[PDB]
Amino acid sequence: LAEALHMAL
Ligand SMILES: [Co+2]
């Protein structure tokens, strides 16, 4: 989850 969001941002 942490990276799914980080990349999206
Ligand atoms: Co990242």
Side-chain angles (χ1 to χ4, degrees):
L1 175 61
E3 185 54 29
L5 303 180
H6 187 241
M7 181 57 78
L9 284 168

